[PDB]
Symmetry: D2
Amino acid sequence: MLALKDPSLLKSQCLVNGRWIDAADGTTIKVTNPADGSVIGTVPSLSVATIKEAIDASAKALSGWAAKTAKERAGILRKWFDLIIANADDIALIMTSEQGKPLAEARGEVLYAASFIEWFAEEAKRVYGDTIPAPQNGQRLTVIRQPVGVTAAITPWNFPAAMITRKAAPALAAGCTMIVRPADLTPLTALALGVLAEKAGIPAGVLQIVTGKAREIGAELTSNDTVRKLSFTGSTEVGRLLMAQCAPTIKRISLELGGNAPFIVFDDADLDAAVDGAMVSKYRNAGQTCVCANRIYVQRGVYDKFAEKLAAKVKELKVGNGTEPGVVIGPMIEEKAITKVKAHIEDAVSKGAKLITGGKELGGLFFEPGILTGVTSDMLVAKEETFGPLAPLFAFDTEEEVIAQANDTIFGLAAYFYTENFSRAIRVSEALEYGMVGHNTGLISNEVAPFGGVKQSGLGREGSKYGIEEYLETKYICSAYKR
Amino acid sequence: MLALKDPSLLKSQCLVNGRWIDAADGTTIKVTNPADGSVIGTVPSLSVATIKEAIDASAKALSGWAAKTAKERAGILRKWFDLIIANADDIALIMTSEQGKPLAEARGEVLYAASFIEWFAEEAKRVYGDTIPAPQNGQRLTVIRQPVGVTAAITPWNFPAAMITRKAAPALAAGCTMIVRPADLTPLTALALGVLAEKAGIPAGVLQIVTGKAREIGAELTSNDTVRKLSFTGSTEVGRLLMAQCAPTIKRISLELGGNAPFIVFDDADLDAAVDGAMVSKYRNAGQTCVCANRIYVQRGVYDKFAEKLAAKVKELKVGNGTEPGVVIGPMIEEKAITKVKAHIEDAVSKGAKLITGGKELGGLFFEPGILTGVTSDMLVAKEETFGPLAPLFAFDTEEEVIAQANDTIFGLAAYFYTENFSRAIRVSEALEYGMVGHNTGLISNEVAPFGGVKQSGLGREGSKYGIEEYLETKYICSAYKR
Amino acid sequence: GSMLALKDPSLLKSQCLVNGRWIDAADGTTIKVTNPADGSVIGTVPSLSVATIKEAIDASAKALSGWAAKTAKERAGILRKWFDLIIANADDIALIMTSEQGKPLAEARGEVLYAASFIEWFAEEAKRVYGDTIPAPQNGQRLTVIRQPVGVTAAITPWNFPAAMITRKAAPALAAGCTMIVRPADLTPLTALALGVLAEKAGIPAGVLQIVTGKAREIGAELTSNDTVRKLSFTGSTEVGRLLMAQCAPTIKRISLELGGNAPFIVFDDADLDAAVDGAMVSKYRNAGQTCVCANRIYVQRGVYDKFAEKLAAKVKELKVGNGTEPGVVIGPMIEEKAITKVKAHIEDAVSKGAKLITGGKELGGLFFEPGILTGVTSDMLVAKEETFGPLAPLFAFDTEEEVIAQANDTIFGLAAYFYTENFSRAIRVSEALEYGMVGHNTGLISNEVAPFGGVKQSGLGREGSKYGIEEYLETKYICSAYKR
Amino acid sequence: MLALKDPSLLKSQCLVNGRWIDAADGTTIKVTNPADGSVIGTVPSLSVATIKEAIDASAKALSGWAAKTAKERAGILRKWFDLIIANADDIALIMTSEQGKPLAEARGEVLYAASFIEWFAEEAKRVYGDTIPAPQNGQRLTVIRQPVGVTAAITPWNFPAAMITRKAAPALAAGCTMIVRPADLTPLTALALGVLAEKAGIPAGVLQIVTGKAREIGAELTSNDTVRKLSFTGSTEVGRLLMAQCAPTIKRISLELGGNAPFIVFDDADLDAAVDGAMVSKYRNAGQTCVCANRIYVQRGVYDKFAEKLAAKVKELKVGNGTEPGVVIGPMIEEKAITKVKAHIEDAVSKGAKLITGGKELGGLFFEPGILTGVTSDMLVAKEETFGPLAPLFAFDTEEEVIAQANDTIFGLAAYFYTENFSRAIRVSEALEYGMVGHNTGLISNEVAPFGGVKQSGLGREGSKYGIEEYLETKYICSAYKR
């Protein structure tokens, strides 16, 4: 058994219209611990019919949830926030168990996840409209914002709590309802957040958590007329399909998709700080975050020193079961993740790169953090996301050249650069074709800043003063009056 | 010939990379006057190969246009605005000639169209970014807003100037370039606007205007990686396809599509003002618009009086060639449109409605403004857009019923209602599921307020403080510093 | 011996909070706090000296650097702890408040939750102090606007809302990263000290918030002359705000003021008449009529004048007057005998000029005064120009919208105004025409934390609450940075 | 006779209620040219009784001006802007003649002055209000902004055009009327703007320009009940008085007062950039601006080398009559000013400073650009503004010491610093207790950013997003409705 302070947090059922249900046909998905292969439990594999019932239940709850005051919805969301915080350790263990990441990371994610609920509880009261000077006398112009309505979220495995709250928080705050389908590999964290949602007083049908086959559930959420808005985080390939599948009813859509993050270290970097930044943006979550450094570009002058410093740190990383003290790298999520990191390694080396450390299988789903030197733009890793604990170090000579290579991608989520020079900070931060830029830091994640991509990395933003509008419609009211 | 003070405004060529060009194969589209059948001129039917050339010219021009200051882009845009106003009469004639609407409406549309250019020239200098309090010490958070890039606009025949400036003004103001494809039925106004763009000093490739097959040109614009944003106004059917076509590269998309606008008259309306608002929202552009009142809901207590008052006004509308004094209703755009109006009349009458005035062909493309009484929800006009000069008057008893009926559509563009009661004003303006609501006025159009739809009526807004952001990408910069 | 029946006795203080310590006056002198319901002495608080005030100001300056250097997130967390603690102690704060000020417990409780709401709101605002980036007119430059705390600030607060007036100033100041010195009214300092106990307990650091009691003139003179204080915020009489603004002039201090009002409450023929009577009852008789936004002049259109008066008169007859801790009591005693004299002067002037006292308006013993109503009130009566600050509804008849607009606006004041109509267009006309910072339409209660509260004309400077409140405690800094392209 | 293309721009009367008038008793103030001493002309010395009539005249005009749409006020203001830009040369000649600055600076100021009118013309249309979520059901919360009413402006001699437009443009844009009293020494530029204001279609009584004794006119403006806001730019001493004078009526008030601007050069500055920045912030207008560098702090490591490079540039400064080709330094404005500049030199040298260059009378009101080295905190120029063409170079050792010294003043208008380090830019820019900070630039002036001070440098801001609010009152409306 998992050693949970509150064992009622671990669920084998879906949350549908305020009840916990199995699949009509009793079919299930096993959830296995990537550290040891042990079966944690099962979750339902819901049918389309049941998904349709969840959608009806969402539409039925919408009226009353939307008709509450912003202050009432905010009080309920703040209770949910407080409940998550009070149960952080349990939730962290569930997550580490199903996802792999070490408990300290899991715990960090829980607090981060919780912060969007807090932040959007506060935003709910700050959904401001406008009055606008009228071009004609005898008219008054107003703009109000109202909830889009029933909404759907589809979320990935790499951040099993935080990708959920980033969508459910602003949606519920705005007065919308939401149905969430968490990834098959990591549904238990979502279910636990659902237990606490119910305990918080989020009424029946406002929030629903459904598990089952991605394609069938995804196709119903995007074809059902009642759903007015989809938010998805995951691969670009699936994002492209979902946008197409929304087109017949012109659904509002938000997408956070693939990246190919460059991480640029200039000769006048604080080099030690650049090393610490690379370590956190490359090796957090075993390299499996959307914003992870994928390509580390280091200027000729500091290349050898940077590589040598990074090796000293990579060599100290403890790999193992996430519940074990001192482990900072967990197992990878699935075997095909390992194959891909291997293919990246083997391609680079066959093109002349040197695997200077690690990058080896350690048994089961465990993989050793590693570094390549001599990496160039003709290698696979230049164009494709590794999604694993591999640091490819690309030499460069000039700022122009690095900016050109950094932007030479269909993606545009996150980028990072280190420099102490004021002017270059301006040029490079502006020239980078990315939604998010870390300057002198590898950790850019919070709830107060808008998160998202340009180009093929997605649509819309999460967090911040800009997040809630993804779940609102703007209404212009033009009123004539007798003067 | 058309009596133009500046005949060089009438073009037979496309604007590609600052040059005026014909098709490579010489092919063309004829532009006819719907009032008399005469041929005004021809425009090219460009090939996809030429469109690809125009897309590259656009990307060539972007860098230089984006690097200008906001202030310099504003100066150029104001210059354009000023040229359009100065040449308003000539533009209005080209418009009436190809499109059909009376000169006075065309003139009104030209000033309206120019107002977007003025508005967004001013908004160029007001693209504000943010500083956000950092959750951690030693960091500072900034948000800036930058041009999306190369953009495309695809525009309809019913407002052949304003639908272009609504799109091109904000794009260009933001630092984007745009390629515009106007409707085959009304391309000459677009080309006229392009001539004044050149004169304004908008550089080669920043604005380009391309004529040709809708499907082929549209397919290239939505499949070419260089194009990063599409903005389309037109049919819902075509908007669905274009969104789907944008999906493989996850393009930013703005759509303004069908409506099925309700116009609601309560017992406590200023009945006379309600009639004037009805006349203005129903018969302008001969009812040929997605914001035109399509369903006129009149509360039982005032139904008869309202019908009588509306008949007297409808019978005064003079139909004829739009260049002719006193004409306020021109020809409809094509024969298929007239048949639709006939279909709505016979369907309704066959189901119990009474055609109390007009509603018959007058020769050529001329159709006589009409009114049906006794219209109900099983009739075709309850669910389909007439796009012509027919007022269907639906009776209702209660606020609740009329709201349910107004909202019973897949669309949500414009709605209108008339009441003197303060509380009803709040209740109805908020319950109406529409992006735009006219209360005691039938005229809601301007450049300062946000225009667009909810539900299947579209994505994004035009005009207002909210319009420019459709052409901007948000960038979050997280900077660490040494305390 | 005896005590208020406090659940937590430690909330009742007899000392001032100065640099994280609870202190008496260097000379031992004190101010006595008396319960206006029965003349019993609740306790004393110190009468501090100007020298002790100067030490509080140095302490505030010393505390400022570290408090401002915290993240918005930390300051918010601390502020939210204070908020949670106020809520958790609301019944005891209410009893303290009712005991010293007079208002009924239900009203006291209501004020504490209202007070607390500013702290919650500003805790949230702290993390939302946004600056700007502005497109540069020249290439090679970048423009930024940041907002930073003004610094050491001072608040001087009245007796009519002994908790809220303090939270409405301290919450935004501290949220912004300022420190604040608060001097509350001699008549009601205990509530303010209770809030200070919970501020400490919340982790507000030594010197960041301080509460000093003593003579208004002397303490106000020091706060307004001392170079260290960069902002004053004051709520009270217009006569005092005039003095205080003059006293900030030598050093150009930032200043916020919420002063006198002369609220017109206007009932048209097309009002929902019962709802207007309810709105009148709440805006006139809450806090026994001693609120800055209380209806002062009640204008009723001739067509509904008679019906309105009869309905109001029936409600006023049911008002129960008594000790604010007694069950059912909705009118407490007035705060002091001069308040009674004024209400009596207003009655006598009105009657001398033709008005009729149709009910109430008599002394009941002690500081108790009977709610009352005048009919036939006109523009030449004193109450047309001066606030009564008592439980007296003066009913002015009017014939047209234009005439009532002109009369409403015929005042140097411009704080709150109210009006009842069901007509959409009139709502627009009247609400825009009224020369007031705050307007209630079809309601007599407009107070909350999320909208900007304050006045035009001689009713004051700046706004409290809302997205606009925190900027009263911030300075705008424009940074123009050149860079190499 | 001044060589003006349009001699109707040179006035000898006041603009009061749409009319040009003299004082009722015929008294006048002579306006002399500081370059040669000739009398340019006279202006009236209006009586208090006449000021009272302007005030009544302003109140009478308020209502009609406020009742206009923003669109309409904006058009009138843009005509005013257009007319100033068309007459720039002549306004420039008038300005150089009366206050002494070169024609090139004069022209620059007219264009700068004009930019405010253009800017607030555009802001008039963007006076936005809010809607706010109501804590109670059945209530809606609105916020609108309306004109404060009749306003007064008192303006200085050093920018005789821009200081007026900076106050009148936002006032008029907001829907206020304004009475301007310009400085005795430089009233003719005001009256010229007045001529164009009339031409522009600014209605009688909306803008008025009155000349006369400062104490008397300002006493009336500050004690008359009708005047609801005063905006004053000038000496701190007079600001302190005007603010106390406003107190008995709780008048709204904007002040921009004394500065004591520190200009800081760190060892890692771009040194020549910093010398060019110093030349421009110290020597424009002969050092007679508000925001001029008064204390030039130079880090020990680069002091002598900076002092050397500054000395080269000062030496090239052509001093002369402003109308003279190549003159970049005009006369000072009055003898009083030379006396103080001389006192600063005497005190400095007596406490050990060396006068390495210039710093002496050239006859008349001309005075030679100078530089002092060895300047220290116990000298006079450390606490008092020279307001002349004298550069005192203070040496410092550490960032911490120079921040302390920078901030060791009652003032907080403008400051400047030069550094190439990113982290230092953050620290110093945030640490400096100033309203405006130039970083690596001496030129910070424009219409789009907010200008004003902290501490005893003033209240309120001019220009930008924030400027118009100084002329608006906020009104909160809380409306109950029947659900």
